[PDB]
């Protein structure tokens, strides 16, 4: 294992982003990456692998670059990634994000991965489209299934600009969505890990990441 900034082709990402993590694990969002490995975070196979167990607990960049929906220039990130299969435990985890930041509050999308759904759906993957930024039963959501669980690395390619939000896995425009109600200047990107639901680690192995 080594530290993923010794792939090159992971360092335009990394320099446009933080690293977050647990308290425990970080004292400070990570924001220098060379030289830089933790079980958290690090390379094996020439890929950037987050790894983090426990309900609410992550190990995801942060992209720093923050907008609007409206914005005239795309923000656009793509990834190749492969979700291993997860552990038996590992309920609900988040592997990108449009983050609402500091204004909007709520995501405004969740690409993630469960266990099990009821939309009876199993190791599925869900587009999770925000209708408004509310708490417990007062949220409104599109909830896009997105199929299951590739066996072997897939890519995703979120965009937003002039206030459409689309999701494309492989190709395939999933998620296509007039998002101008969103009115939140404080926008950005994330990719790694989140788990919102499970004890043991989950992994998620970036085979490329870049954000523009
Ligand atoms: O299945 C279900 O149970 C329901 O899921 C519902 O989606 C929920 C999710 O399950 C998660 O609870 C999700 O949590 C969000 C949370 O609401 C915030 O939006 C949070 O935002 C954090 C930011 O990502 C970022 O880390 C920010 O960093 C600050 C921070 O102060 C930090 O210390 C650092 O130093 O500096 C930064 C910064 O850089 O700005 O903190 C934000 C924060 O509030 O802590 O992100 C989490 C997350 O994991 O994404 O909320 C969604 C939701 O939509 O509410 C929903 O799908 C529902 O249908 C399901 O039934």
Sequence with gaps: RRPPWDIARFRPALRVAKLQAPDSVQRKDVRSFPNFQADHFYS???????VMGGDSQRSELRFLDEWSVRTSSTRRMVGVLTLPTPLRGMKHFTWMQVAGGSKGKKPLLRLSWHDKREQDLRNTMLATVRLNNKSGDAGRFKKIVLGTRPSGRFVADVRVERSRLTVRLNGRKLVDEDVGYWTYSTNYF??????????????????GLTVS
């Design 190 to 207: 994330k990719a790694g890990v989140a788990v919102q639901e499970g004890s043991p680690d989950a992994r998620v192995v970036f085979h």
């Design 44 to 50: 094996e196979n020439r890929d950037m692998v987050f």
